Amino acid sequence: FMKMSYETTCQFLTKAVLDNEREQLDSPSARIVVGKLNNVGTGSFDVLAKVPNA
Amino acid sequence: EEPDREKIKLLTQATSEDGTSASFQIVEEDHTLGNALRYVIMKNPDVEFCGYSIPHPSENLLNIRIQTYGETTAVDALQKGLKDLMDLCDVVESKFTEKIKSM
Amino acid sequence: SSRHGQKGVCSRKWPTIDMPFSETGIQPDIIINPHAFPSRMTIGMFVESLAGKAGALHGIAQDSTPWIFNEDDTPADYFGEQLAKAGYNYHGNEPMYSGATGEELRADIYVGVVYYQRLRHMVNDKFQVRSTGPVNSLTMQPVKGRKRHGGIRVGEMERDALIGHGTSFLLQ
Amino acid sequence: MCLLGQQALEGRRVPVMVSGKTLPSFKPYETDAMAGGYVKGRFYSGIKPQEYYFHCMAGREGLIDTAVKTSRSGYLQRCLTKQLEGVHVSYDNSIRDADGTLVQFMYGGDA
Amino acid sequence: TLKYICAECSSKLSLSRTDAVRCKDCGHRILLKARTKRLVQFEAR
Amino acid sequence: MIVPVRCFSCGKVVGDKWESYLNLLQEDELDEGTALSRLGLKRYCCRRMILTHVDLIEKFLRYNPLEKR
Amino acid sequence: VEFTPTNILSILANLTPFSDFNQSPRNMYQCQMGKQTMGTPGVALCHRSDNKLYRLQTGQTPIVKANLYDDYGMDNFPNGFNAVVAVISYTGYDMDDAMIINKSADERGFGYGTMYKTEKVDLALNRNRGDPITQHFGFGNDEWPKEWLEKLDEDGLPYIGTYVEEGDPICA
Amino acid sequence: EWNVEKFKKDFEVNISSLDAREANFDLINIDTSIANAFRRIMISEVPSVAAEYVYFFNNTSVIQDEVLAHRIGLVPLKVDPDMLTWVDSNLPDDEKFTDENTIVLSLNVKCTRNPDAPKGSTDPKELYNNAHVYARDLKFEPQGRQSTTFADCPVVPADPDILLAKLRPGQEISLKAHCILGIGGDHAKFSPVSTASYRLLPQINILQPIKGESARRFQKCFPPGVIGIDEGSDEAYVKDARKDTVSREVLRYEEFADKVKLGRVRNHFIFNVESAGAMTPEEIFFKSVRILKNKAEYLKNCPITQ
Amino acid sequence: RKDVPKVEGLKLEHFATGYDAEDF
Amino acid sequence: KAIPKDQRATTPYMTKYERARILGTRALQISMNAPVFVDLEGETDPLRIAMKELAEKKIPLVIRRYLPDGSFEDWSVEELIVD
Amino acid sequence: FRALMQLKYMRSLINPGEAVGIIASQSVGEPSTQMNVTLGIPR
Amino acid sequence: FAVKLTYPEPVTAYNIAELRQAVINGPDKWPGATQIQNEDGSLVSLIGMSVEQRKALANQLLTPSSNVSTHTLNKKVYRHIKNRDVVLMNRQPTLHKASMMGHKVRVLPNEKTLRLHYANTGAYNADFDGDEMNMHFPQNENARAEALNLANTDSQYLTPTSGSPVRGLIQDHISAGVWLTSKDSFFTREQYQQYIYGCIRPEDGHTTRSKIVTLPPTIFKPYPLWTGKQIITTVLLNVTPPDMPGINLISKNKIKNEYWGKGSLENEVLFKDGALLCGILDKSQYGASKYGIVHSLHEVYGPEVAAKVLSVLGRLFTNYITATAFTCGMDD
RNA sequence: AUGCGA
Ligand SMILES: [Zn+2]
Ligand SMILES: [Zn+2]
């Protein structure tokens, strides 16, 4: 997706499809394309909660 | 008729409890009243510090802070300012009338 | 803007009481910051101020043709002498008092009469806000244009800047 | 307060016509400094018209450089901003891309 | 009586839904709608 | 448009002083300076008000569409 | 020899007083501002129908002017006003490119201007001859809100002079 | 030590000139904050009576309705502003305007042509009838009480000669202006003074004496009458420092800039109050000082809230 | 070159507040 | 993927980005009726409330620090040096 | 004092997750707008 | 914008009063609220509801659960933007992340233009000539917390390009600091204290003392007199925390000593325990973003203090430029 | 798309 979103979009698309490529959705641009929390900065980690069991 | 409840306000954030440091906020005022009132207030020998500040021209607000020592209260010192301004303006009016008559 | 390409927005409509008043009993129409001149070198504006002041006091128009004057016949001398005959500072300053406090300012303030022009670009009126509006059917994103109640663009560079900040939850 | 001084264009003195003249009023090959564009006049006492044409030359070519520099810096920003946007600090202080490929073992080598 | 002035003859007239949009005194085809005695309030600023 | 009512800078009503001022420049063959001195415009904010005025309304009024021509 | 060195300047550059005293690009920005200035576009404006006009009502003749200001008659179409200007940083809102106006001056009409927008209400803009026609300014069903007469005369056109705000009917 | 009575001992007034439209008076031994207070109040806070709501019924003139309304607002009216109280806003328009708070001025002018002047343009006033609309055409329309109250103070513009509008045959102006009580601070049309300003008394401290033709040559550097020489063989004296304008022209010459100092008297204030005709300038000053006092009474009376 | 001429009616047009040409 | 607690090797300090996300998410929880474990003391801004909760470390949140390998370290607020 | 400066050094380190790539790109681009061998933007 | 920008505020027991009032005000007031979104998902616009109907809804903001499908939610109120929200300002040039910062919203009455402090204009490369700015209002506590903690202006006091301060006072404030800080500038007790309260409002949280403190005059003699450097001492003594010693710095000016006389010494800027003892201040000091005074306060007490110092200086110098002003003319 | 504001 980072290739697609710079230049020769269709050329990078063609080389991607011909590869049967899978996007691991790491590129910040690519991640934006899919509406995903950006992996940089505050999205570099996850937050969980400690909850009482009793 | 009612004692105006919003003209002057005592900013708890800016007022001692012992009794000699307050910031007062008057609505719809500026340097007009402010600089004269601080000027007369500085005549009080018991005022340590007094001054006025406009939070913002567009807001049409006036804050006047009086911090004194334990020999007067800031409310009392302010009343001393206002009694001085009223009597002084009486003096101005009186001499002005006298010289208008003397012509 | 003046006739000197020194354009500025009106930051505020200063109360007449708060303006500075001269010992002539007036408070200026416009106040321009002096620090604008040192980069622009719009000294023609300084001369236009002192010429419009002389010409208003004596009550005559002044000729501003380029090179009517000469290094040996400077405009500061011509309008300086004319103004000084009029009854005003040869350098063109006037003693002003603070509107706010009332003391006399440190120095004589440079006051004069300048042709000022109002640009049609009241970009003040060009303001726009959109918290809700139409969307293009091919995207469901805010439509375009102020008159369309459209939404300003968060461009590619603003995306880059939000990634810079680490503000990935703001970028999302 | 002093003088404007020597006007320049693209790094050198005033253009000269093929007749050898830098302005109609100058004889061909005038060796006067002014004829090359050196303005002795100053803003406080004005500039001669022959000098106003040169300060106008420098001022315009300035406005051209001012209007072209911003087109040569957008592509400089975006061309590598596309590449390093994935590039961040790993939790181990190593610089990894958003792929995971390591770029530097420390930021500038000091963190 | 509603009014319409001829853009080219100044002649006042009172068009109807039953007449040609033309100045009956000159023949022009452009008519300024006349101002009338109609109240408008104004803040003097 | 039309001679301003008051001088922007000072506040003195000036709109009454236009026609007499123009008369003083015509009828009395006075000069603009002396005419303004006799009008009491003794400040340059006032001086300039009338001195610089351009009564463009006379040019506007010839376009009056409410009378035949 | 030149008849006058002004013969090398354009019209607007001669209209700029003391143009030989400013940094050149400030004179060029002066041509762009005076050229972009809201002024008097004409006097037959009641017989034009521009999509927009900007007309300054309080127009004046500069005290400081080129003699080509008279020779080209630009005094027919004054584009500005003579203001009392103090070159002073004092209020704290005059920095970089921002300037202060006197409030009382604006209240007295200083630089007061008006903007005209012309509209065409066409009912054939895309009709289709005899058949198509059927729309007539006016009413028919009575069921309309009679408060529309508060804006539109009983002939379907608004009363010339009417105050209108977004949402008001411009014709029926 | 400072007391208000030591001020009363120290405070002085000297009135140089009292015209029914201008007052030039001095306040000696006061604080700048007080002189500036009086000035500021005389300008913004002293109420005056001015047109506020202009109701047009017709305007066919080449002048914009809004503009003409603002111009009618600017006309100062010769009205004692104490004949009326303020108009509130908390209440409906039917209660807003009464004969106690509003003054009605009608204007109905219809321009015509005159039966054939001499040549042609023989001005405008002879070619046309009511071609010039003046403030003097604002007919005062009383209601009831104030009809009687103004029996001996009818409403007139303080300058009838103000040209308000110029018409052409068939053009007409019909409007009804509602003049209310307002203060110069809320809009400049309510300011009752044209110019209320103060200037500190110029002080010319001659450090060393000058004499002869250098003394008279110094004398010509100042306004005619500021510097007097009686003999000049012994001194060049100051007839009146009040005549000076502080042009600081004397400093242009080394003959003097090292043998004179130019200062001011911080205590001495030279007030100049010129009235727009609504009220006499001294009465305006009286209202300003009584206004400041009334404000101090308002602050005494108010309860400190929290 | 001729120097631009100074005005012939180059005379006082400003006074203090309080004064006039009755002192001139 | 579980980095053993005995083996956590990362910065003992809370990053500004960690602090930002914690305060935002926890504030949002208080604003959605998460039980407040501290005196509201008058406050009405949920964000300032979450800031108070950070000041007393009463926050019941855990930061999952990711490593680009995929291993992560679960860190409590109550240990990560807040500032 | 050496202990203080070491602790300042520990407390001055770049945070995990910093967007240093973008920051780099802007720190080379942004100042290049103010701009025998090729110099400036062409270089 | 204050009446046309909303935040979707979930109503609780702690904000019921404020949101009930905001609803009562309605869309056509200050901190009212334009709309109410139920937990059932439906929207109720207040665009045209009467004070009576909005009053009725104010007593329903806290209603009980109704459907097990919705029992976990609480109603939402679309409140107008107010003085407690952070907003992300961006100026085109984006050229760098520092050109798009988060500012705390202050609704100004009778304005029509986005109002910005001068200290930011060297980071946006913005100038009032006619420059336009985009104002983004984030709709989420995560974006609020980030715009108040990460992107905020104080976190941008230095650029990452070089770490030179990009945020300082400008033009008039610089010349005012040069004039105020001259050994020639003296001030009476009245003037000194007036400038002080003019620049410090303890009621505004502008201090770490909750009262005011003051210095002895420079001149005990004929008359009690304070210097301008004593004023900078008083402001620094009042803005720094009482639990910390005064900043100690030896900086320099952009004004050679030769200009102040043949023996004058005014280029050495000396700060001893919070007290300016020699020299003036200029662009090199609080605007130069190079160790100068403001940079040193940023380093010692951090960005919140340095920002407080900048606002205090901006007010001090603006007011003193009101008392004495600054001008330039042909004589110059 | 053309001109243009920053
Ligand atoms: Zn006709
Ligand atoms: Zn005037």
Short mmCIF file of C-alpha atoms in Angstrom, two decimals, chain C residues 52-60 83 86-88 94, chain F residues 33 37 42-44 47 51, chain G residues 63, chain I residues 11 13-14:
data_model
loop_
_atom_site.label_atom_id
_atom_site.label_comp_id
_atom_site.label_asym_id
_atom_site.label_seq_id
_atom_site.Cartn_x
_atom_site.Cartn_y
_atom_site.Cartn_z
CA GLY C 52 0.05 64.97 3.99
CA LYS C 53 0.48 66.61 7.38
CA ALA C 54 2.13 69.71 5.93
CA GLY C 55 -0.39 69.82 3.12
CA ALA C 56 -3.36 69.53 5.42
CA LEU C 57 -2.08 72.24 7.73
CA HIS C 58 -1.22 74.71 4.97
CA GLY C 59 -4.20 73.32 3.10
CA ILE C 60 -2.66 72.41 -0.26
CA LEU C 83 5.68 72.17 8.44
CA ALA C 86 3.15 75.87 9.98
CA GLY C 87 3.75 75.47 13.70
CA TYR C 88 4.71 71.81 13.97
CA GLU C 94 3.85 65.41 17.96
CA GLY F 33 -6.35 77.36 3.51
CA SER F 37 -9.45 78.95 8.70
CA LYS F 42 -8.42 74.67 13.02
CA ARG F 43 -7.23 71.06 13.28
CA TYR F 44 -5.71 69.07 10.45
CA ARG F 47 -8.75 70.60 7.77
CA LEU F 51 -10.03 69.99 2.01
CA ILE G 63 -3.29 65.30 -0.34
CA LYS I 11 2.70 80.94 7.46
CA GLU I 13 -1.54 77.53 10.68
CA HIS I 14 -1.31 75.99 14.18
#
